Design a protein around this ligand. Structure first.
Ligand code: FMN
Ligand code: FMN
Lengths: 305, 304
């Protein structure tokens, strides 16, 4: 039987649902080019601030048997750099491009969005706004109101994980007020875990006394929960999954929970962009064994008891 | 060299830091007896409500490669039952006893505490109050209400927090209450969703498959919370809970700041015999590292 990983959304066609997670292998020109050349369906640029940032002292990332911990500190080449990539360099013939934005204040987001507008219009780059801010529902509302007010396009929002239905309801209520928010990416890292190495009797990253965001196998059930929670509560919007994807089977779970696109962080950091060839092959293999032809056939169809 | 896992706190001596996590293998008389007969340093009774509760429909617990997911729904024998165990049955000669309380309202906790007071005085049972803790005003009000009617030290079981603003706010509140002498970190990571790829379904019945996560999933979160409160509440002790399967895991809890170490998922899967293994393993770890007592490394995790 004929089978396809194609995704159609945001006025774009994607060969497959896979892309990098913001922050992973998408900071430099070489990384952005490598992502574009890869088998991924899309890519997103490193979350940017108005000016270049060095980020936190090293070590600031550690791979772990069950995932990763990091406190990168937003090291990035600055907004001008990513805007120029989107405007002059990216080959839109190959795949669509998302640009991740993480201003350190409302003002910074407003000023960057005003400049992004023209490039989105002319080239088709799509904004993923990083709110992970989102544990303060008032700050989240203010951020979104400001961006919505000045940015004349649809966009998406990258969310931190929530852990109770009251939070899911409060966040969904806010997101649903903004028609321009067309996708929601669930999730950013599980915040402020602490990895201790028994051998060294020490933490494993330098910033913040060793506290850092968790990714990888640790976060998969939390990611699936958030994907599904917002899938249910925001029926007018698309959900992008992010968290714990190492295999085609993991990706299948994201889609079953409601994901349209599937982002890959920790596993990509460890394996490099060749991972996308493996993931597409594996996801097709999973669909073959389960007798599915397209993603629409099972997206959001997780069975409850 | 002579080693010791002894812990001394709240006017009690504990043979070792290990105990069950509230909710795991401590609902029935049979379970409470088995925990008392085990090699554990202590035990805590199932979180209780004023009256018995049947809990949520089954399946409501599932063991997983990396831990567990559950939505039990507070199935418990009711406060009178656990009070009677504490008052009339428990052999305090064997080990100290904690009683976990989880009223569904502030008034319920107040009324239970008024009655617990006399038994705490007479027999020495220690309250672990299951916290409402994502709402700091509510938490302060609850602790005020309980403190007013309960003339003893007690501890609080906390959900995990995920940022320093929350660690700071929670710590500030707990520090307002001198009667709160220990903080247990952590309860489950809330409302995860496990999906079985084979069945294309969730694995528990209540709440559309959403449930609390325990086990390997939660260890770095538990360590973070243990250490965050260890640092911010220097006048209190911290009890660790989350992701303990081995003596090495316990070693990490203690390095982060834990005095007692609670075992949930791993105990559910292995039974009370786990405590013999854990005491043996922790002593092995300590011998390899040349530590004789837990005081020598409690809270001493090195930062970079
Ligand atoms: C080294 C590193 C850098 C990251 N940078 C960003 C970032 O700039 N913006 C962002 O929204 N998320 C960032 N994240 C979070 C990832 O996008 C992703 O949400 C998280 O790692 C969970 O996915 P995973 O389990 O596939 O790693 C970063 C994660 C890592 C490990
Ligand atoms: C089946 C089950 C029942 C539980 N019941 C309670 C409870 O009644 N009160 C409570 O404070 N925590 C309860 N918990 C949470 C545990 O006490 C513990 O905080 C959590 O499982 C993390 O520890 P672990 O990683 O060792 O499982 C329960 C956990 C499980 C799996």
């Amino acid at each position: 039987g004929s089978m396809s990983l194609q995704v159609n959304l945001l006025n774009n066609t994607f060969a497959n649902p896979f892309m990098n997670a913001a922050g992973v292998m998408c900071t430099t020109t070489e990384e952005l080019v490598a992502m574009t050349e890869s088998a991924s369906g899309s890519l997103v640029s490193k979350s940017c601030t108005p000016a270049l940032r060095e980020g936190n002292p090293t070590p600031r990332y550690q791979a772990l048997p069950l995932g990763s911990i990091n406190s990168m500190g937003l090291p990035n080449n600055g907004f001008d750099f990513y805007l120029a990539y989107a405007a002059e360099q990216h080959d839109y013939g190959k795949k669509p491009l998302f640009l991740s934005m993480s201003g350190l204040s409302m003002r910074e987001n407003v000023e960057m969005c005003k400049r992004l507008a023209a490039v989105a219009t002319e080239k088709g780059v799509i904004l993923e706004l990083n709110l992970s801010v989102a544990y303060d529902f008032d700050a989240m509302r203010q951020c979104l109101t400001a961006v919505s007010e000045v940015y004349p396009h649809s966009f998406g929002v990258k969310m931190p994980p929530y852990f109770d239905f009251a939070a899911f309801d409060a966040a969904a209520e806010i997101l649903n007020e903004f028609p321009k928010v067309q996708f929601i990416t669930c999730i950013n890292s599980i915040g402020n875990g602490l990895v201790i190495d028994a051998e060294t009797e020490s933490v494993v990253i330098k910033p913040k006394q060793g506290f850092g965001g968790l990714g990888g196998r640790y976060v998969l059930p939390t990611a699936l929960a958030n994907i599904n929670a917002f899938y249910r509560r925001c029926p007018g919007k698309l959900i992008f999954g992010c968290g714990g994807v190492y295999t085609g089977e993991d990706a299948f779970l994201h889609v079953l929970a409601g994901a349209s696109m599937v982002q890959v962080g920790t596993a990509l950091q460890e394996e490099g962009p060749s991972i996308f060839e493996r993931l597409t092959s594996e996801l097709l293999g999973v669909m073959a064994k389960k007798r599915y032809q397209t993603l629409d056939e099972f997206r959001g169809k997780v069975r409850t008891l």
